[PDB]
Design a protein around this ligand. Structure first.
Ligand SMILES: [Mg+2]
Ligand SMILES: [Mg+2]
Ligand SMILES: [Mg+2]
Ligand SMILES: [Mg+2]
Lengths: 282, 287, 281, 282
């Protein structure tokens, strides 16, 4: 009953640490849902990856939106899309925001990097962008999460903060502060400086050893597990493909994998079996 | 080098047993190519399932073609698409055949069942024998690449009609131009396949899917003279397995520490995406 | 404003004779709204044609839905889509309906011909109309059932037997079609229908019959089915032939709209104002 | 004879060639039935028919699909107005590949900044590499890359129109589209004097349309693009037909001023399908 946009809104603004898991297609979206996660992360790298292309705007934004439409169709929990820089200027970003709203997607995460191709995009430009998105939403609960690439690009806390504040002031519903460092330093230094001006979102891929409660004490609002399903999937597929190739039989894979009937259950095949008995004449 | 259509055509007509592996997206199509496989099976179940829908004509034929376009861009070996019934009558089938050729797809597999399902131990009626035969012919008459392949999937055994139907249909489709016949069975044993091969007298290449009777020694297929085997959906199933387990572990743990060393690295993904080429090209084309 | 679905339902249930005009792409949808029409008919023949294909389900349903997404994005009045037979069985229909809602389309018209002169089984099609009514999430989304009995050669008995089956199944309106050059089939149906539900007609073949005669018969709505497409084609043919021969633009430049008119139709204006506000000076 | 080959031949030929604009499958077939040897897939025309603005709103794959349909409905080549390639050199090459597979004979690219951040034009050096990048990726040697120079539209001199034009020609361009917003061919005449027949030249005489055609043959121009007239003509017929039916609530005043339904079935090649249904359905 609760709108997906709204569910994501509540998680960002909640005073408790929330988690969203990555998914990259309709199938993974259902699995993340059944597992119990309260939200899905539409990973830009995972989506371009499963398509077999590079994470550098190769697939058009509409090809990415369609993958997300199928993902949205197969889940009841909100999906926060990793939308790069919005695939163009403020106009492309607002057009994207309206299409996602209509597809059932709950929010979009935009970063302040240059597009296409450590200078980044102008703060005022990217601020006007968030604001454009914010002024274009037809659903007040759709979320725009601003991602600051200051630390990653080599700038200091100063650049980060200045950016986060400009974005939060433009209307961002949350700030995703990232760091490629192997520990949470840029983040702890940010958390102190931030002053809790708004919910903060982190991607602990590189400092994954840092305990999670440490994120609770820093006041962090939401954590993103960024790409582990794509990575888990590739390993399993590489393994099974090698296994079958070498064996020239299925004897060594059949019991190490999900049955065909578990596939049908995930596709909700029974609902159709039942609709067909009710809708197909005698 | 050699056209993908030609590579698939040579596999279908070769004397030895050939194998093709299931892929359902660009990523899995590259992994299959890397493993050494000489071809890819564009599984209908695997494609619809990754999209999250049922294997019953929900995604449009152009949404399926699009998934396959990515698969073909990411692989050098032929892809044989499971094209259900051609998505309509003979006219929809030839239009599909033209789009697949243009997309780099090597062939299409069409099955003789009714479409769409209009009716809810009596055998299940299939398509009219003369009608399906003409659809195969319409496709052969329409393809622009002489080596594109039309594989005819016979549903007789599965639908409850014995060997008698299976052979009349296979003969009718082969005679209509099919490049190969795919004989399937509901059984957990190869008996239907065995009986058909015995009666077929090698009138044309035969393709099979050992999914339900997987314990059957592979050498036995070679003895029947089967031309190709299709490993139908195991990459999709291994993926579900891996994603269900990785998700549950991170959900429970609320940390990555217990999965980080059981999945490939992010750099492995970059290599599958051929990130290196982009690097080298931006060096050659960016001021 | 009010929901497009609701606008269409009110027009069908209205006691006034309503009119919806054919559009086949984003541009034509926009022109139809500006003219004043309270609704748009997403003609199956027009969409197919503009794409350069036959009206025999050659382009796919998602390709047709995308054309309509652009049309819906470009208009404020409801678009009723000609969805042929729903592009498959009941399941394909209910999936289609769901996507049309999400894209802003107001309703869909489904015909009882066989897919891909016998028609689809009555019960089967009725159960399909039902599946759509049971699946739609916007209660105002309109499902229009098109009876092809008269065109199929059958008689008034069939047309009636089928109109009643479909309406009892939940259809929001019945489109009664005839190939005749006079309204004989339509007047006979209306006489024996006893107003069991709103009726929709397409006066394409009997366009000489005064429109007031339909009002008198109690017809709820009329569809101008393909005139903008036919108009666009005869102008493009003449424009192309004139430039081709002349090898010059001097003899067409004054018979066609200026490029400024095109920009206005694109709401290019709103973007300039937007770039003015969102792009840093 | 390949479509790509057919185009290249028109660009490097002796006579002045003409290509007429089309924006969908239906208009492409009309352009062909009329006798034109080529089709101009107008950016303005394609986005307009979709009802969006000519500013990169429709994704590049959405544009490619429209062109795919046009391609299937015509036997003569189509030169596609591809903005700046929809991204950097990489986006540009991917577009070229997909265009070749779709049967498009060529892409026309312009030397401007993308996206808009608003007159500076694209770095001369970068566009040159962009042009090259596309040339190096072709799989068909006869696929044409037309470089459109905006110097004169950007407000630069002839010295800049020739500087860019010569650079893009050395990069690989198959032709040079010199455009001028003047209502006379002065700019075109000036550039033609300067150019020194270093490559085929294409012009868009939309504004200076009173200029006699032989004048263009004289200067040595290789091809003329009738840029947007079928769209404009269509729009006139639609606004008029629509107004006429709205007012009269009848079709008696348009039924004799429009083509017939049979004519539509003919243009759709309906008879070709009847013949097929004949031979392929029991
Ligand atoms: Mg990303
Ligand atoms: Mg299948
Ligand atoms: Mg129709
Ligand atoms: Mg342009």
């Amino acid at each position: 009953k609760v709108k997906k946009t709204t569910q994501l809104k509540q998680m960002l603004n909640s005073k408790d640490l929330e988690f969203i898991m990555e998914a990259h297609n309709g199938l993974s979206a259902r699995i993340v849902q059944e597992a119990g996660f309260k939200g899905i992360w539409g990973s830009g790298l995972s989506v371009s990856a499963q398509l077999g292309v590079r994470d550098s705007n190769e697939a058009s934004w509409t090809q990415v939106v369609e993958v997300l439409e199928f993902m949205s169709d197969a889940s009841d929990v909100p999906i926060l899309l990793d939308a790069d820089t919005g695939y163009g200027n403020f106009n492309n970003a607002r057009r994207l925001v309206r299409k996602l709203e209509d597809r059932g997607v709950a929010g979009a995460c935009l970063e302040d990097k240059l597009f296409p191709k450590q200078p980044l995009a102008d703060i005022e430009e990217f601020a006007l962008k968030i604001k454009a998105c914010k002024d274009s939403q037809t659903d007040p609960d759709f979320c725009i999460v601003a991602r600051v690439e200051a630390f990653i690009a080599g700038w200091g806390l100063d650049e980060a903060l200045k950016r986060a504040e400009a974005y939060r002031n433009a209307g961002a519903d949350a700030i995703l502060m990232h760091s490629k460092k192997a520990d949470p330093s840029d983040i702890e230094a940010f958390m102190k400086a931030w002053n809790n001006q708004g919910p903060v979102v982190i991607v602990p891929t590189k400092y994954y050893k840092t305990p999670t409660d440490h994120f609770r004490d820093m006041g962090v609002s939401m954590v993103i597990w960024a790409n582990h399903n794509l990575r888990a999937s590739v390993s399993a597929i590489q393994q099974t493909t090698k296994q079958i190739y070498d064996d020239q039989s299925l004897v060594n894979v059949e019991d190490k994998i999900v049955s065909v009937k578990e596939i049908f259950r995930l596709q909700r095949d029974d609902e159709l079996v039942q609709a067909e008995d009710k809708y197909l004449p005698k």
